[PDB]
Structure 1
């Protein structure tokens, strides 16, 4: 003889997530400008957070928002990111108005909804970069050598965002990040 949980319990998410903010400051290290906002693990708590913060579209150029599974820091050095990479979405200046905010929300929902099904374990989180030269959004995965998982995640993500199918996107390995003044990171896969 107990109350029906459907009438009062919050709707749980498979994982607990953490949202981070990056504030641009040249006089300090990258890590020093990165700070945690808060965490949540239910549908209700996700909306409570999203509804009171600024849309990416309104942030000052140079700042970022990052949503990662609790325990995984949004940086290359992390145990779960060092051997991984990211599927990169490169937006033009006009998309700041038309697609940035809509794309970022769909990205958030793809993560907390575990929309990559059988390859959910390879997903680490996502990052949106607000920049004057052109905004960027990316989904980070844990292992660049897991071809099956990486290509499936890329396909689903591209489909969910809904941009024209003829547009190809690439996946970059973090370890491959350019360090030689005169080169640029190449793509491991494309979908």
Structure 2
């Protein structure tokens, strides 16, 4: 068990205890970083699936030295592919999230250097899964990634993909979509 399959990138897993906090509160926790398939699986097998974590929690897998925030240099000019999961079962939820992680670490996208990370929001009622990219103006990259996502998760009309710029996402209570699939 000495040898492990190397990944192209180093990834970091993040846990968000609470989605609402005061301006000085840091509810975002680094859990660990990994460089190999085996290390990822080892991490995965020891943490709770998103169907079992607290409501108002987040899971986030981002490349090393990129925070799960849009204020970060890697995310500032970028955006995200959003998938809304209304009335989705737990096994389907866990499977979608895992398949997303596998897309990331497995480098399933041609524009790999456009991928920043991904995050799942568990809110009980309606959960969400998002894939963050570096540049919202990079139409080719965004579209390619979106199509790959659509195929890799076998999405139909029922669940639409929405590409939203992080700058346009600043609403207290809908958000404009640059691209739709």
Q: TM-score range by the shorter chain?
A: over 0.9
Residue in 1 aligned with 2:92? 99
Question: Normalising to structure 2: TM-score of the pair?
Answer: 0.93
Instruction: Tell me, yes or no, if structure 1 residue 45 matches structure 2 residue 55.
Output: no
Q: Distance in 1 between matches of 2:61 and 2:120?
A: 9
Partner of 2:26: 32
Range moving further from structure 2, 119-128 or 165-174? 165-174
Determine the C-alpha separation between the residues in 1 that align with 2:3 and 2:21.
Answer: 46
**Hey, what does 1:185 align to over in structure 2?**
175
Higher fraction of helix: 1
Q: Matches of 2:50 and 2:125 in 1, distance apart?
A: 15
Change in 2 beyond 3 A, CA 1:151/1:30: farther
* Structure with the higher fraction of residues in strand conformation: 2
Structure 1 residue 20: Cα displacement? 0.2
- RMSD (Å) for aligned C-alpha atoms: 1.9
Give, in whole Å, the separation in 1 of the partners of 2:159 and 2:21: 38
Unpaired segments of 5 or more residues in structure 2? none
- The C-alpha deviation readout for 1:82-129, integer Å capped at 9, x for no partner, is 101000000012x14242100000000000000002x01100000000
TM-score (norm. length: structure 1) = 0.88
SS at match of 2:26: helix
